[PDB]
Amino acid sequence: MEELNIIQGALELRTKTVEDVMTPLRDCFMITGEAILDFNTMSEIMESGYTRIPVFEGERSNIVDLLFVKDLAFVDPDDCTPLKTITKFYNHPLHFVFNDTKLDAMLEEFKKGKSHLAIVQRVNNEGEGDPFYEVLGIVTLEDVIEEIIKSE
Amino acid sequence: MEELNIIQGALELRTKTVEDVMTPLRDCFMITGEAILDFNTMSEIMESGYTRIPVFEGERSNIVDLLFVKDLAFVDPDDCTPLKTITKFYNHPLHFVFNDTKLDAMLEEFKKGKSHLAIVQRVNNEGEGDPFYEVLGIVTLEDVIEEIIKSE
């Protein structure tokens, strides 16, 4: 039964972590903060089919903003408007989560607030001096829902 | 518990119908088949935030096609390209469902195939001669999932 599938998935939300379901950094669709919104860039973006796109500066682990595809609505490609204008303008909130966070807690976190996307990070205790936060990938509400309802 | 919420919702999928959760025709974001994709039209479309937009010809109950926002990726607004070009090109499938259809069966129907959006309709036995199909609104996967996970 589908109902049984959903119930079991719901039960497993306690044990599975965000690390188990995240879209890792190698698999993340991201965009440089230096980007300019000419025709072609906007075209690749609208082509991606992703609703929201992480914006990074320099390194991919240096995620600085979020771009919603909606924000291109009033953008004229002929203007070749830089991305920073849109990102600094909307200044969409950035949500973070630890790799060990359970999916049920993630669901709870997502249901409250606008964030339906979280950035996964870990503590690097393998110093070499100061311990650091290591960005691993992204996890969305979609990742966990898909984990809930999928056939198993 | 969240898990309890999800479980109960899953259980109720048997009893609730597509009529109970659909976005009705008054609340449907739709677009005329005659539409042209200048800047402003594309701008309203990208503004909507909806991933998929029903295309109708004449009456709103005369839904003829589906438009994915993705399909605007390679569209130059300066070209003022008509919608029919894109719709006839992609010719995305159209899914239909009866109002009495239970949500669990809907879930089953959605999980198989690309259709994550269905058009609700009913039989008009209030003839007046020939009985007809009366379009009532739309129901997506998102509608049912939202119905599953929401707090109750």
In short:
Two copies of one chain form a homodimer. Chain A is of the alpha/beta class.
Question: Can you tell me about this structure?
Answer:
The structure is a homodimer of 152-residue chains. Chain A has six helices and nine strands. Chain A is an alpha/beta fold and 152 residues long. Chain A has a single domain, classed as Roll (CBS-domain), CATH 3.10.580. In chain A, the strands form three sheets. Chain A has a four-stranded mixed beta sheet. The longest helix of chain A has 11 residues, at 2-12. Chain A is globular. Chains A and B meet through α1, α3, α5 and α6 of A and α1, α2, α4 and α5 of B. Chains A, B: This is Metal transporter CNNM2.
Topology:
The structure is a homodimer of 152-residue chains.
Chain A: H1 2-12, H2 18-21, E1 23-24, E2 31-32, E3 36-37, H3 39-48, E4 52-56, E5 63-68, E6 81-82, H4 83-90, E7 96-98, H5 103-111, E8 117-124, E9 132-140, H6 141-149
Features:
homodimer, 152 residues, alpha/beta, CBS-domain, four-stranded mixed sheet, three-stranded mixed sheet, 6 helices, 26% strand, globular
Strand percent estimate of chain A = 25-35%
Q: Main beta sheet of chain A: strand number and arrangement?
A: 4 strands, mixed
Q: What is the helix/strand order of chain A?
A: HHEEEHEEEHEHEEH
Oligomer: homodimer
For the largest interface, the chains and their residue counts are:
A-B, 32 and 32 residues
Helix content of chain A: 25-40%
Which radius of gyration of chain A do the C-alpha atoms yield?
17 Å
